[PDB]
Amino acid sequence: IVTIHQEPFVYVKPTMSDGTCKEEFTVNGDPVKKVICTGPNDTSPGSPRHTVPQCCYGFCIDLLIKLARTMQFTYEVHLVADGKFGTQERVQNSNKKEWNGMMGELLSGQADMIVAPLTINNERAQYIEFSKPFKYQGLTILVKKEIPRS
């Protein structure tokens, strides 16, 4: 399973020196269940081409754990080397067309499932199937408070 970095969905914190993550309780009083990822380096995989173990937890990780406990299967979560969602690379310069990023890695047979905030549209669903959505949202614009000090 390949996951993408998202501020409210998937958190990526460095592991401790022992080899695991620093277990910390939440405000409600329940122990947070977190898994370990094997994503790329911090800055970029270009110059420092080396993968380091990290920690993974959040909404997507919780849903993945729930599905794994419901269907009783095993998974190996790891981030994408491209670090992007993906697009349609139909450049005629190479006479070939193929997807890149997370979808490109999925279509290459490397992964089997995708637990990430992936939207639904015709171009992407024309090649892969999408189940029922678990959350609805839209598009908006984020601006500053502009500091009213008249």
């Binding site: 639904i120 549209n121 015709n122 669903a125 024309q126 999408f130 029922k132 959505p133």
Partner: protein, 419 residues
């Protein structure tokens, strides 16, 4: 035949056909005399947002469709194991597709394949707008208590020190501290409390400075007093279907009336989760949407549980602003509508692609703005034409009574200490 997603139109009085942008509709009625036969020979007209979506799908997949109304059930519920209604008509090989306002749940999706959702739906309680009475202590709103204490101590110190020093230094009885503070008291509360005017040029200069300070303080004080003396601070009756008001209404306040209509998806969803709540609402079952709305408007009940979309539409496109939904856009068990397709079909992918293309084209937003706008759907207008009754500004009568009691107890203490 439901909320204006797909509506039935009567036959033309003289044309005998349907108007533009309308498709021929068929309705089979079996409520007449069944002595010989009566296969509902009635033809009407049908149109709406759902008809527009169906036309957009048909103009992209290039297929032909007929319209047939069901006369068995509303949407279809599991009764003794035999589905009756639109779901039963689809599963009994009597039809292939089913469009409208059908809800997608576990059982229906397990028995009938559904397409991708095209609109958001959910459970939301609709209650009457509860209005507040008044916010107490409104006359002290455009200021802070620390500011009041600072102003009081400044008044006292300035009066005492300035008047005493300038009367002793600079050359009718003497000007005591009582008249000294009384002069500044009259000066900041607008005027007229008859007061004993002082002598000396420097004392008059200080009085003029204090008068300027007082005329600045009144202009600063009635900046937004009227704006603060109008707020009501509306409070919602209940947070949702999770407190004890809906869980255990036995050992609580007088019986709160709340319920929903039977034979629906929300009824089964409540029965599966809340057994006691469903058993309590069984006695308060409604007999229609309009009847339940009229009962809620009269006062026989104070809570209605139904789909969020239709309730929001009825709250928006109503006479003025009568009722509003709790939470201002809350949805429980968020689901979506769709098009019921026969099991093991091939048109499901085509319908999904057509819906995705319509979503990516932007026509869905236009259709929503054309068919889902309401009157009270916008924000509330400005509150004007106020009355300011006794309860509105009675907060100063408490101060008056407290001051009267203070004067009485001080008079009693003085009479006791005089002896």
């Amino acid at each position: 035949e439901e909320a204006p997603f797909v509506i039935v139109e009567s036959v033309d009085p003289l044309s005998g056909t349907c108007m533009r942008n309308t498709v021929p509709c068929q309705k089979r009625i079996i409520s007449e005399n069944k002595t010989d036969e009566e296969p509902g020979y009635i033809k009407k007209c049908c149109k709406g947002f759902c008809i527009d979506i169906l036309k957009k799908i048909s103009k992209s997949v290039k297929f032909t469709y007929d319209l047939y109304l069901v006369t068995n059930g509303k949407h279809g519920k599991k009764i003794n194991g035999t589905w009756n209604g639109m779901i039963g008509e689809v599963v009994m090989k009597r039809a292939y597709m089913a469009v409208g306002s059908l809800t997608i749940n576990e059982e229906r999706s397990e028995v009938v394949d559904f397409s991708v959702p095209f609109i958001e739906t959910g459970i939301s309680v609709m209650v009457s707008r509860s209005n507040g009475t008044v916010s107490p202590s409104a006359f002290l709103e455009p200021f802070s208590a620390d500011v009041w204490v600072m102003m009081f101590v400044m008044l006292l110190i300035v009066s005492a020190v300035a008047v005493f020093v300038f009367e002793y230094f600079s050359p009718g009885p003497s000007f005591t501290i009582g008249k000294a503070i009384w002069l500044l008291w009259g000066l900041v509360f607008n005027n007229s409390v008859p007061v004993q005017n002082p002598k000396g040029t420097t004392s008059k200069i200080m009085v003029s400075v204090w008068a300027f300070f007082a005329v600045i303080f009144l202009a600063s004080y009635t900046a937004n007093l009227a704006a603060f003396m109008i707020q009501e601070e509306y409070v919602d009756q209940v947070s949702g279907l999770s407190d004890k008001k809906f869980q255990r209404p036995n050992d609580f306040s007088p019986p709160f009336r709340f319920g929903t209509v039977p034979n629906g998806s929300t009824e089964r969803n409540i029965r599966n989760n809340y057994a006691e709540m469903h058993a309590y609402m069984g006695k308060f079952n409604q007999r229609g949407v309009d009847d339940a709305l009229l009962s809620l408007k009269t006062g026989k009940l104070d809570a209605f549980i139904y789909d969020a979309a239709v309730l929001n539409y009825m709250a928006g496109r109503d006479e003025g602003c009568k009722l509003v939904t709790i939470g201002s856009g809350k949805v429980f068990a968020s689901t979506g509508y769709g098009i019921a397709i026969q099991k093991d079909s091939g048109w499901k992918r085509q319908v999904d692609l057509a819906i995705l293309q319509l979503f990516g084209d932007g026509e869905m937003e236009e259709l929503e703005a054309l068919w889902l706008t309401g009157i009270c759907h916008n924000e509330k207008n400005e509150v004007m034409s106020s009355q300011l009754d006794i309860d509105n500004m009675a907060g100063v009568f408490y101060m008056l009574g407290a001051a009267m009691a203070l004067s009485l107890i001080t008079f009693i203490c003085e009479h006791l200490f005089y002896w």
